[PDB]
Write a protein that binds this ligand. Structure first.
Ligand SMILES: C[C@H]1[C@H](O)CN1c1nc(N2C[C@@H]3[C@@H](CC(=O)O)[C@@H]3C2)cc(C(F)(F)F)c1C#N
Ligand SMILES: C[C@H]1[C@H](O)CN1c1nc(N2C[C@@H]3[C@@H](CC(=O)O)[C@@H]3C2)cc(C(F)(F)F)c1C#N
Lengths: 301, 296
């Protein structure tokens, strides 16, 4: 159906079916064990951020690769249950829709993960070339196939060149995985999110160190953002002024899975509403904190 | 008297194929993923269909997208699903299956959704005349005993040529199930159950447990790659060596392949010796393939 021009927030990235099993003891190889509880959850960074944007009251869309089948069916029904627009999915003829299997041991909190395979082709620059960008006010790209995503980012830049400042599509990039190919993505977007994990891998021992160490890698005018879990989040822009927000931890932590994606979606949302970077940092920390005391995404607002 | 009925579980298996079994607290990327219809009675129906046998499945399912996959899979195989016990409370069972590509080893993390099992009242509503053979996978034993008493009652009124043959499977090491040994013409006892009762071989298990079976019954015990043994009223122990593939790639459902193949061979009039050999043959062939396609 009709989507008003410059009304949606697009998130480009991964969707995965997460099968979480909670066990009394880790299974011995070649055995059958009854788990205590099992959950099927739609995951992925871009995927999780869409859930949060819908719950925040933002019209949003997901762009990512899926293969026709029963896994895709579950994921599409889950996206739709969360009011996520799924018209821009890159339907693939080869490969499996990603599925991960998580075994959580009760006696110690240990997590064993059998990650999805590599068979599914990622969204390409040619796939993205075919997208009418006019319905999007904001485009968020989760760093994966960087050389392709760079061409996608060059296409949004080309678009904005022909646009009055109010019809300009805002852009954000996420560098969450400590893979060198992704570090070229720092030079793209108005907002650049860098994970604690990536920063630590580059030798940075704090969000301040990471922002001061990596700011020279961003495009002119860009805002570099780094959330450091329960130590709050920092942002740094062209004025050279480091901004900080403390974390808003819940009275009891229940579920941290997707807290970072809650932060990213909330920062994007607050900025898209015309709020300052300081206000967006505080808001992202508040929503992220609220999420940590909740199972899943229900009740974050 | 044309169909083989299998009473038991249907489970959606979420299968991950790995290069090496994951060490606890680690992250490993799998090689490939698939969805497979599983459960012991359910797997035996797949094998019976592929063997050319008209078969039916009786088991509990709850309406939903999991049941939809399973029903479409059953139907794709030509398994008769008319006798499924549709439940209004619960979800359909699912499991996480890790298959090690190096050796075919399978590890299952199972989610028993606490769906109500098939009851004796559910089974009383079944027209037994279309069945030549009824196989029950041991689950809710006190309720399955009444189901077995119903088949016995039916056979009493039948001439020997129109008598329904009965098999029972005691796969789980739960004491409740050990009453099922006294029922059926063919009794399959797992290696796992035998080991739990202190038996170190199929011959030990058969000699140790034979006194527990019905008069004239055949006790069968498959001991994985060590082959299978059977023991009947003549007191003569029968053995078949396994048929291992040169490369074992997937053991998930090998035992169910054995059970279905023994049942099939016996239903065709073959000797117990021939049925044991055929059972090991087909199970062995399955172990060198992914899934059940190509076992025949
Ligand atoms: C996004 C960051 C901002 O820096 C604040 N916020 C928080 N992140 C936390 N984690 C991130 C990481 C999550 C795993 C995952 O993202 O899947 C672990 C724990 C924990 C808390 C907490 F618990 F203190 F509330 C907060 C708060 N506020
Ligand atoms: C049924 C028994 C007869 O005794 C022969 N047969 C085999 N069972 C095997 N397993 C049983 C158990 C399976 C897991 C599961 O049933 O889900 C493990 C391994 C392995 C092989 C093998 F590999 F050697 F071929 C054969 C053969 N033939």
């Amino acid at each position: 159906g009709l989507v008003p021009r410059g009304s949606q927030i697009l998130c480009v990235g991964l969707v995965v079916l997460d099968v979480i099993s909670l066990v009394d003891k880790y299974p011995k190889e070649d055995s059958e064990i009854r788990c205590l509880s099992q959950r099927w959850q739609r995951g992925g960074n871009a995927s999780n951020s869409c859930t949060v944007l819908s719950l925040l009251g933002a019209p949003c869309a997901f762009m990512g690769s899926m293969a026709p089948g029963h896994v895709a069916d579950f994921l599409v029904a889950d996206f739709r249950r969360r009011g996520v627009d799924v018209s821009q999915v890159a339907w693939q003829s080869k490969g499996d829709t990603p599925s991960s299997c998580c075994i959580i041991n009760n006696s110690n909190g240990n997590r064993t993960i059998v990650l999805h395979d590599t068979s599914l082709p990622d969204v390409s620059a040619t796939d993205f070339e075919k997208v009418d960008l006019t319905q999007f006010k904001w485009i968020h790209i989760e760093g994966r196939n960087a050389s392709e995503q760079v061409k996608m980012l060059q296409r949004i830049d080309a678009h904005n060149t022909r646009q009055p400042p109010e019809q300009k599509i805002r852009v954000s990039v996420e560098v969450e995985k400590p893979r060198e190919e992704l570090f070229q993505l720092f030079g793209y977007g108005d907002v650049v999110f860098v994970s604690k994990d990536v920063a630590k891998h580059l030798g940075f021992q704090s969000a301040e160190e990471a922002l001061r160490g990596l700011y020279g890698r961003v495009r002119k005018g860009a805002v570099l953002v780094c959330a450091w879990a329960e130590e709050g989040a920092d942002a740094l822009g062209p004025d050279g002024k480091l901004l900080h927000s403390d974390a808003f931890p819940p009275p009891r932590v229940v579920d941290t899975l997707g807290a970072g994606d809650t932060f990213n979606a909330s920062v994007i949302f607050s900025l898209s509403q015309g709020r300052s970077v300081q206000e967006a940092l505080r808001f992202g920390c508040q929503v992220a904190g609220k999420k940590c005391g909740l199972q899943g995404f229900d009740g974050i607002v």
